[PDB]
Amino acid sequence: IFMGNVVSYLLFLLLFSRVLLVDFQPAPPGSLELLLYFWAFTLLCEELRQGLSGSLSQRLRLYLADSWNQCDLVALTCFLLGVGCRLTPGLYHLGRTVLCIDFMVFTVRLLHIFTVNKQLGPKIVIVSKMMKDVFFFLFFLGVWLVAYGVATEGLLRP
């Protein structure tokens, strides 16, 4: 079942990229875009089933307290928002942009899918423990960038 779902998710990403890079036009949606809509609907139904089978309020709070389920909810919400924007005649480019970012959000869930895998799992969970070092690096880099960039811009006087 894990292998089948991995293959299905890879094909879903392939279809998503095919629709995003080729089939996405200001015209009404075509067959492949509607197939992508149906596939995202089935993904949403699976997520809803998993949330139900996991009181209603306590279960919803449990679902919304999980970081990866927050990411999956963000993915599905952005997909819905981009589709709604695109179907509106005015907001086609906004829908394209939202769906472009939503593709990244969908793709980064391969790590969460393969967390169960024996080889990738421990290192994937180690990766999340490096964010404090990353944030220290970003803070020091931001301070240095501000100082150096403002000094150079002031010296050069463009």
Q: What sign for the dihedral angle of Cα 65, 67, 68, 72?
A: positive
Q: Which stretch binds its own copies (CB under 8 A): 6-14, 61-69, 71-79, 83-91?
A: 6-14
The size of the interface with its own copies (CB under 8 A), counted in residues, is 71
Helices 92-107, 67-87: inter-axial angle, 10-degree rounding: 160
Residues 6+ apart with CB under 8 A from 45: none
Question: Between the CA atoms of 111, 113, 118 and 124, what dihedral angle is there, to the nearest 10 degrees?
Answer: 20
4 binds its own copies (CB under 8 A): yes
Please pick, from the candidates 34, 38, 60, 74, the single residue that binds its own copies as defined by CB under 8 A.
38
State which residue, 26 or 84, has the beta carbon closest to its own copies: 26
Task: Find out whether 69 is annotated in a ligand binding site.
Answer: yes
Task: Find out whether 117 is annotated in a ligand binding site.
Answer: no
With CA atoms as reference, report the closest residue to 99 among 46, 28, 37. 37
DSSP tag of 157: -
State which residue, 5 or 88, has the beta carbon closest to its own copies: 5
Q: How many residues would you count in the chain?
A: 158
Q: What is the footprint of its own copies within residues 115-144 (CB under 8 A)?
A: 115-116, 119-123, 125-127, 129-130, 132-137, 139-140, 143-144
The least distance separating its own copies from the CB of residue 65, rounded to whole angstroms, comes to: 15
Task: Find out whether 70 is annotated in a ligand binding site.
Answer: no
Q: How far apart are CA 148 and CA 64, in angstroms?
A: 42
State which residue, 68 or 87, has the beta carbon closest to its own copies: 68
